[PDB]
Write a protein that binds this ligand. Structure first.
Ligand SMILES: O=C(O)[C@@](O)(COP(=O)(O)O)[C@H](O)[C@H](O)COP(=O)(O)O
Ligand SMILES: O=C(O)[C@@](O)(COP(=O)(O)O)[C@H](O)[C@H](O)COP(=O)(O)O
Ligand SMILES: O=C(O)[C@@](O)(COP(=O)(O)O)[C@H](O)[C@H](O)COP(=O)(O)O
Ligand SMILES: [Mg+2]
Ligand SMILES: [Mg+2]
Ligand SMILES: [Mg+2]
Lengths: 123, 467, 467, 316, 151, 123
């Protein structure tokens, strides 16, 4: 009987309870996003990797949900390499930030994909 | 002056027995009938009472040094042995004005009567009287209306008022309640009332009763041309419920509501009294539970103290006993607290159990209500003892009449007016009482019928609460 | 069945003495200790009590015929002479469920204890116990939280809780009050409290005290890392004032307030209890004035009845006596009502004065509070009598310590934990009590200092309320 | 958008036993469940305010518990606080305290509480930013038999109008009845903006919603780790999968129970995203995950042979 | 006293079928007309109904050990066949007073009729009657007036 | 006259004012809880050993009361050695955590025992 660890066990939503994604596994997630004709976008954050509540405590209000946009959503992107290239570009420029890849469905106007693609040292 | 703190226990008398103290006109004075355990000297017993009802505890505390204890401590300043009793003393205690919260009878009793009655060192303890200084009296609203204003609102003068409790106590429906009420009121009574325990129950919910009773009283008023009232009971389990009942009565435009001040409590009674003042409603006070506290001479609180407390908290009427009825009440003691309820000033008079002189600084007087086991033959005695400023109530004495409620009321109204007329003409009610009643029976069939039924009914038993 | 109305007076026993009656599980049963006047037979005395506390009056009324009296009347169904007393009997009376207003302790006492104690035909009367049927119990909210929830909110388990009344009783300023409080709390006590008479007065207004006390308790909590509380007294003269005090306490975020239920009254106590439930505030109940009613064996109301009434009206704590302290309390009788306050079911047990079996249908239990004249040497006895589910309070026993408040608290906390440890290890507290304390004095200077001061202090007097 | 959760079905759990737990024990169970990976936990439908646990006490401890779990994991958590009461006034009193606590979600039994009370609460939740979870207690009294009553699809449409953010939809594979095609029919009626007539799925009329928000279907009732592939395949990402016994029945406790469910779900999501057929490769995907997840391995072992197969009463 | 926790599914009858239980006057009693699926024993179907309308679920949970399940569980205490009827029974279930919110009909029905009617193991289910104990009856206001007052 | 200290004087509820429990004393407390047929359970906390108020300040609300459960309550346990063994196991896995032993009473549903069995260095 194992006791689930309490320390340094922060998670990052979808796919975070699985083993780290290998190069090919990550590329397959991107392929999935593109195959569904969703728009890819990269977001990064250096100061608040996790949700907190500083400005308000009313129902549904949380700080830390918004991250900062890397360039612009990749409208018309049909090649995973492009997304993976931008990811590297973002890493070299923000090696100490958390970086996630999201995919927008413009018809429903809902993010259908969202997973952490990179974590700074210490995580 | 400062002193070094010394931990340990000292006798209460070293700090609380002050026989040389002269009382200030701002002090609350108390007269306790103290019965100490064997071996406890009266000075120590009196001091313990004063200490634990004001500022002290069982052992020395250093915090006394942060304040001026001489200025706040209660002081047993006088002791006297009681004649005709063994190991019993009357101990007088003085409490400074500062110890009490303004306008709170609740706070006053919490200090004076809070924990001292359970002291192991005492066999029994009874609070006989309190001298309420005029500076404290002014912090209370008093009766929402009082004797003068009530008579003026109802347009009734020159005789005692007449009431009646509806019976049976519990068990009647709302409509039957109104039926009984109309019949009683149309025959000459000024008021009818809910029994003290009639609040809201499965057989009769309050709102239905209030509604049917309002219809009944207005019909009786229209028929007789005399202003009528029915004490609607606002006694309830919570302040909120009590208030909802008072509010509906106000909406109905009726003149009077009632409250059981002891079972309901002083905090709720004071709230209701203020509402009655703000809304023009007369407030009748029933003293249910008082005898649990005030019947024995050796332990408890005398009724006169509970009466003064009501005058402060607020009530337009208050039951005062009958002397001659089914419940205990000695004539001299009764007259004593009756003056304390009606007058502006009553001098110390120990033959009537009045331990201190009491001034009321124009606080309105309270109308004493004589009720319980009384009937027509008691009329001359009641009229002679209480006088015009009283309410005489006949529950069983009205609904027990062989011809019904209206004839029962008529018998009571006629018996009263015959006494009033005779007294006014100079006749002696205490001497010619039976003769006066007999004379009225000659022209009043209703009164004649009442007289024959209750002719041999008397209530004579040795009283427990005496002087 | 119908019958012709016959005016006149009949003996109460013809209608109210029903020795063949089998009680319903929905009836409220009462045990009265009746002492009749000479010449009044016990059957008549018991019947009078039953009649005047339910449906009857002194003479026959025709209105009884409009209802079904058999269904509503109170019935004296059993009588037994009391051993060791002359002309005294225990009379059992049954009251149907319909007579009472749901959720109103005020209405319940109004009927059962309303007017019967003052009857001329009785020398004395005492209500010893009430069997509250489960159907009526369910109409009350009960304690706003109760034992389990309280321990869970405060995160305290495995030992009695510790309190302390600030002294002197009256006279300290708001800031000095907070000063005393912080010092007491930082030394190990779980709570401190306003004295029962500390409401709002010239020397210390309530809001200032609440504010300074909140600062003090938060500082002590931060320093010790253990949750603290200070019973803020909401007792006031009106429902409105009481409410304003509870509201501010809520605003401060503190865990507990207190109320003097008897001086404040049942109507106001029930209101406060509901507010405490709605707002998450623990409610400590002080029984100021109880001894005025419950000390004598021949007249009044036993505390167990006043205790059951509080469990119904609502209170998380209630003082229960100490047995060994400065105020009266016999061990067997005390343990009896302690079970009635904490348990879900207590069987009839006359050796402890329990006249009827009582079920609570999961109404939360109330935490008994032992306070008054107790000190370190009493710790083993208190721990043995009450057990873990209790609050032990040391006012003079903390502020009377030679080194001050913090060391006084430490002495009390250490003395308690030493007893808890010893008991847990299998030692006999009643046998090895003094030895256990002495062992702790060896490593606790604070406890050693306390022990020397109160070594020869005992409170042993003959009790008045016995069985 | 409010919870910041995308790309997978949400995971919930009903605390057990249904009744009998104290307020502190409720919060204790809640904290352990949420910390293991579940997004939500919930009061059982019949947990309102009773002698063993009064409502305000529960709301208080559950709030402390969920905030602790959230801080530990870094993921937004919630616990459906039950506002169902005997009167509108009582219901509102419970919704108000939830709002004061700053929590994200409350729940209501719309059929036993009633449509009038539900619409009142729906409007209050909109005005105060509270998510509203709807439980369909009593629906089977009305919708089970094919010959008499009202089909669930009509009750589902009524809820979308009255208002609710979630509504139980059945599991198909669980302990409670629900046919696949009929279920798929009303799930579309709950989430989409337009659904055309389709008698094979019991859809008699074409229905348009003119942009009325979709409601999240909640699959709950007798489900476990082995059902994960099937549930993910049937419902898709826009659903909430709840495991009461399936979490609190785990041999290692609540946190490991939650981990098992969260891992099983993510394994199915990853496989699906890679193009794997959940219907055919379901068991394989789960077995693969047990190689690196002790929590999941322990769960699979316990419920390997448990299935719920009986003839359906409600059919097309 | 308590036993160890063992994960796994057990038949509901093991805990919820109590044919020797004597009902208390504070219990809410329910009479259900139960029509089990073929192969489901009436004791199990009756136990399932009692279990899922009170304290149990489909698999064993360790949390039961934190309470005294015996005083809170619903109990199927009696079963009788329906005359001239194929595989139908009247199952009697007792519910302790503590399971219900005072004055709330909504809560009473949520428990007794909440989820059991949709069980796969049952073909049909009908609640015929309920014995409402007087202790629970007193927690309600009832008619605003009633026959007597209305007239 | 001694002045009660202010610094580094945090307490841990029941038994915390007595000298540190010895191995034998600790075992006796465990015997006690078992003799009363209560259910033993271990709880641990690393980040917040004492109560605080971050999320709410209303009456009766405090953060830090809930710690995390070590495995499951020991239903059926009758051997004190079983409990102490778990204490040692919890201690080795979480050396920097405060660890307490509690005992449940299922009938009343209250913890009848609760005491700190171990505290990290510097406490
Ligand atoms: O319940 C009763 O007994 C009464 O209605 C009297 O009825 P009857 O007129 O039918 O006798 C009164 O309340 C008592 O007088 C109260 O006692 P006191 O007035 O002494 O407080
Ligand atoms: O005023 C007092 O005497 C106390 O503060 C005790 O002070 P000490 O701790 O300083 O003695 C308590 O209120 C009494 O115990 C009340 O009596 P009971 O508890 O019996 O109702
Ligand atoms: O009470 C129950 O049985 C549940 O909590 C599930 O518990 P388990 O997770 O322990 O099965 C849900 O409310 C049901 O799913 C209701 O049915 P439906 O979703 O079909 O409305
Ligand atoms: Mg009366
Ligand atoms: Mg005091
Ligand atoms: Mg459920």
């Amino acid at each position: 009987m194992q006791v689930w660890p309490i320390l340094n066990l922060k998670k990052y939503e979808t796919l975070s309870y699985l083993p780290p994604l290998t190069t090919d596994q990550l590329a397959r997630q991107v392929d999935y996003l593109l195959n569904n004709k969703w728009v890819p976008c990269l977001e990064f954050e250096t100061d608040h990797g996790f949700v907190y509540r500083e400005h308000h405590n009313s129902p549904g209000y949380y700080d830390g949900r918004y991250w900062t946009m890397w360039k612009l959503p990749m409208f018309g992107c049909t090649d995973p390499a492009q997304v993976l290239n931008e990811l590297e570009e973002c890493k070299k420029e923000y090696p100490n930030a958390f970086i996630r890849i999201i995919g927008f469905d413009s018809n429903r106007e809902v993010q259908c994909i969202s997973f952490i693609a990179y974590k700074p040292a210490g995580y | 002056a400062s002193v070094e703190f010394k931990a340990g226990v000292k006798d209460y008398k070293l700090t609380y027995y002050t026989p040389e103290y002269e009382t200030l006109d701002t002090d609350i004075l108390a007269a306790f009938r103290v019965s100490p355990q064997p071996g406890v000297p009266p000075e120590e017993a009196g001091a313990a009472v004063a200490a634990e009802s004001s500022t002290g505890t069982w052992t020395t505390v250093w915090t006394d040094g942060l304040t001026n204890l001489d200025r706040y401590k209660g002081r047993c300043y006088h002791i006297e042995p009681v004649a005709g009793e063994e190991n019993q003393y009357i101990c007088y205690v003085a409490y400074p004005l500062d110890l009490f919260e303004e306008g709170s009878v609740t706070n006053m009793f919490t200090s004076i009567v809070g924990n001292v009655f359970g002291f192991k060192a005492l066999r029994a303890l009874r609070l006989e009287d309190l001298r309420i200084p005029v500076a404290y009296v002014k912090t209370f609203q008093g009766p929402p209306h009082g004797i003068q204003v009530e008579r003026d609102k109802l347009n009734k003068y020159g005789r005692p008022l007449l009431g009646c409790t509806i019976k049976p106590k519990l068990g009647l429906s709302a409509k039957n309640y109104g039926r009984a009420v109309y019949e009683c009121l149309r025959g000459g009574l000024d008021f009818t009332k809910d029994d003290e325990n009639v609040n809201s129950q499965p057989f009769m919910r309050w709102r239905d009763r209030f509604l049917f009773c309002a219809e009944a009283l207005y019909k009786a008023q229209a028929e007789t041309g005399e202003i009528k009232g029915h004490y609607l009971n606002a006694t309830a389990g919570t302040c909120e419920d009590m208030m909802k009942r008072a509010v509906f009565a106000r909406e109905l435009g009726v003149p009077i509501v009632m409250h059981d001040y002891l079972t309901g409590g002083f905090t709720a009674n004071t709230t209701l009294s203020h509402y009655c003042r703000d809304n023009g409603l007369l407030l009748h006070i029933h003293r249910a539970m008082h005898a649990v506290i005030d019947r024995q001479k050796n332990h408890g609180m005398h009724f006169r103290v509970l009466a003064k407390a009501l005058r402060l908290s607020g009530g337009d009427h208050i039951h005062s006993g009958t002397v001659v009825g089914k419940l205990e009440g000695e004539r001299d003691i009764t007259l004593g607290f009756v003056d304390l309820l009606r007058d502006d000033y009553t001098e110390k008079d120990r033959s009537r159990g009045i331990y201190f002189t009491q001034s009321w600084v124009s606080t309105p007087g309270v109308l004493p209500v004589a009720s319980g086991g009384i009937h027509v033959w008691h009329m001359p005695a009641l009229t002679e003892i209480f006088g015009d400023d009283s309410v005489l109530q006949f529950g069983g004495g009205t609904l027990g009449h062989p011809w019904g409620n209206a004839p029962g009321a008529v018998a009571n109204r006629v018996a009263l007016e015959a006494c009033v007329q005779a007294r006014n003409e100079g006749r002696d009610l205490a001497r010619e009482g039976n003769t006066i009643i007999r004379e009225a029976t000659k022209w009043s069939p209703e009164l004649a019928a009442a007289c024959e039924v209750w002719k041999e009914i008397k209530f004579e038993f040795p009283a427990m609460d005496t002087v």
